[PDB]
Design a protein around this ligand. Structure first.
Ligand SMILES: NCCCC#Cc1cn([C@H]2C[C@H](O)[C@@H](COP(=O)(O)OP(=O)(O)OP(=O)(O)O)O2)c2ncnc(N)c12
Ligand SMILES: [Cl-]
Ligand SMILES: [Cl-]
Ligand SMILES: [Mg+2]
Ligand SMILES: [Mg+2]
Ligand SMILES: [Mg+2]
Length: 539
DNA sequence: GACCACGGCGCC
DNA sequence: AAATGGCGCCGTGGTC
């Protein structure tokens, strides 16, 4: 392309180079734009940002987040990544998308700008005739990228002092556990090494191996294996406790306080829009979609996520979302009726599991039942089921047959979904998001059946994903108008931050928006809480 | 220092 | 571990 002076004309596509992948932490090393057979390179990248009306191009959101960081209201616009991702969600990297749709991802801003231009042209062409994918792009993905940009640049507050103090307490308990483990082994070793631990458990001590690892076929020391060996030796329980503590300390307690941004004094994640096979977002650097909540220490960590002074967190979470979605997709009357009657399948399963009345079910019991309900739905084997419930095989098997015989059209929907996936090569969500699953026609049964579970899960998980995205796009402008902030999405959950005076009003509005987003054959219900911290807000 | 595969495990 | 699905990050062991 012909080189020309900065600035570019309106509608130009941008290319840019960051010192590191995370836009909140990156230095903008270079910036360029391309349009009409010209490439414009900015002599001073930061100042040049002011000349752009929007960020249009590959990884648009990243540039937008950096702009917002610098106090510039630069929204993201067209991004070829989003087009490619809709065409085929295995399109997750600019490297792959460039190669596939007409160019090469290099380290020069001008070349990236030019690449962005031609990829958009090509990919736009590929979306012609694809009306449903076009709808998702214009009505969901493109607007959502703006929403996510604001969320990333906003961040969430963390009680750093609290976490620092907690680290010290946890360190001392870890020391007690490791000392016991070493005593019981008869000698010290690296307890963080599963290879060393395998030899201690299975070679040095008497313990029977139960399972093997996938890639290298070592004797597994996974939590599943250790639970089964709980009554074989006292060292086992000590290791399980050591694992829990060290996992939480190494992954959350210690790293996160070090990631507070110096300017904002908050913790900023990345919400990746082209990262999953089903249409879910992912979160990284750090991942804020896997903050602990199940165990006592886990809850203590989640409590570190707090509202700004004078504000409150609002947490909203769709009730039994994929089950409701399944009712709609399958059209099973029986299942639809369950939700019309305001029943809770997780609580009911839980009451069965632990053999207690529905009122006796505590949250942790209900949570346990989720794994069982979704596990069975998406193809769990009777054997594992019996195993994880520690009930005889016959009972487990019996539960799965009743599970489905209760809901006739569910199996029918699955069969229909797979048959259609085999013919077309892909399956799709309610709104037409696609996932290609070529292994539906695999001649190896284990490979084929794995593919089948991936395939019939996607429309359900993906539709739920679509619904949340649509809800975020609708909700965002309403929140802006109320002076509230959207902070995090955790798949079927949103966490907002509102001024105390308005927190109650915001919760009600957000609840109604989420419930009314796209009516199905069954009501959508959203549970909402308000609190000074994430844990409090969910209770 | 950075990458990697692996086993493992946090969440949804 | 096992015929649930979807993610990202940890330390280890290893290479470069
Ligand atoms: N906090 C949940 C911890 C255990 C779990 C879970 C799982 C959650 N999902 C998927 C299905 C669910 O609708 C969705 C939302 O997660 P969710 O909100 O935990 O589950 P839910 O909304 O059904 O129940 P609730 O009324 O409490 O919101 O994530 C799953 N899909 C496949 N296998 C699994 N084990 C799970
Ligand atoms: Cl950093
Ligand atoms: Cl839960
Ligand atoms: Mg939910
Ligand atoms: Mg949830
Ligand atoms: Mg892995």
């Amino acid at each position: 392309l012909e080189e020309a002076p900065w600035p570019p004309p309106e509608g130009a596509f941008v290319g840019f180079v960051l010192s590191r992948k995370e836009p909140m932490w990156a230095d903008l090393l270079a910036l360029a734009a391309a349009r009409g057979g010209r490439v414009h390179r900015a002599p001073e990248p930061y100042k040049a940002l002011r000349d752009l009306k929007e960020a249009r191009g590959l990884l648009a959101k990243d540039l937008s987040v950096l702009a917002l960081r610098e106090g510039l209201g630069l929204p993201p616009g067209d991004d070829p990544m989003l087009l490619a991702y809709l065409l085929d969600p295995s399109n997750t990297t600019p490297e792959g998308v460039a190669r596939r749709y007409g160019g090469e991802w290099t380290e020069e801003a001008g070349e990236r700008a030019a690449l962005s231009e031609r990829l958009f042209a090509n990919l736009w062409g590929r979306l012609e005739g694809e009306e449903r994918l076009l709808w998702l792009y214009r009505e969901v993905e493109r607007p959502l990228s703006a929403v996510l940009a604001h969320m990333e640049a906003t961040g969430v507050r963390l009680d750093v002092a609290y976490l620092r103090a907690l680290s010290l307490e946890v360190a001392e308990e870890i020391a007690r556990l490791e000392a016991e483990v070493f005593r019981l082994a008869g000698h010290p070793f690296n307890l963080n090494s599963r290879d060393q631990l395998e030899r201690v458990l299975f070679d040095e001590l008497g313990l029977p191996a139960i399972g093997k690892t996938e890639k290298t076929g070592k004797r597994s020391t996974s939590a599943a294996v250790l639970e089964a060996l709980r009554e074989a030796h006292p060292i086992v329980e000590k290791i399980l406790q050591y694992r829990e503590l060290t996992k939480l300390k190494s992954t959350y307690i210690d790293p996160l306080p070090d990631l507070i941004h110096p300017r904002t004094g908050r913790l900023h994640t990345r919400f990746n829009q082209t990262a999953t096979a089903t249409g879910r977002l992912s979160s990284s650097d750090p991942n804020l979609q896997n903050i602990p909540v199940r165990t006592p220490l886990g809850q203590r960590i989640r409590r570190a996520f707090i509202a700004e002074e004078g504000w409150l967190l609002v947490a909203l979470d769709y009730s039994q979302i994929e089950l409701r979605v399944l009712a709609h997709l399958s059209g099973d009357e029986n299942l639809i009726r369950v939700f019309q009657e305001g029943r809770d399948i997780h609580t009911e399963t839980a009451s069965w599991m632990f053999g207690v009345p529905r009122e006796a079910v505590d949250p942790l019991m209900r949570r346990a039942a989720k794994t069982i309900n979704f596990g069975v739905l998406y193809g769990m084997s009777a054997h594992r089921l019996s195993q994880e419930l520690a009930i005889p095989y016959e009972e487990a098997q019996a539960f799965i047959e009743r599970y489905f015989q209760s809901f006739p059209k569910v199996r029918a929907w699955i069969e229909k979904t797979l048959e259609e996936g085999r013919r077309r090569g892909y399956v799709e969500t309610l709104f037409g998001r696609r996932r290609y699953v070529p292994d539906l026609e695999a001649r190896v049964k284990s490979v084929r059946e794995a593919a089948e579970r991936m395939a019939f899960n996607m429309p359900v998980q993906g539709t739920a994903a679509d619904l949340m995205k649509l809800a975020m796009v609708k909700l965002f402008p309403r929140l802006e108008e109320m002076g509230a902030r959207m902070l995090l999405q955790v798949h079927d959950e949103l966490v907002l931050e509102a001024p105390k005076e308005r927190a109650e009003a915001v919760a009600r509005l957000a609840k109604e928006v989420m419930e009314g987003v796209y009516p199905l054959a069954v009501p959508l219900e959203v549970e909402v809480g308000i609190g000074e911290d994430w844990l409090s807000a969910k209770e």
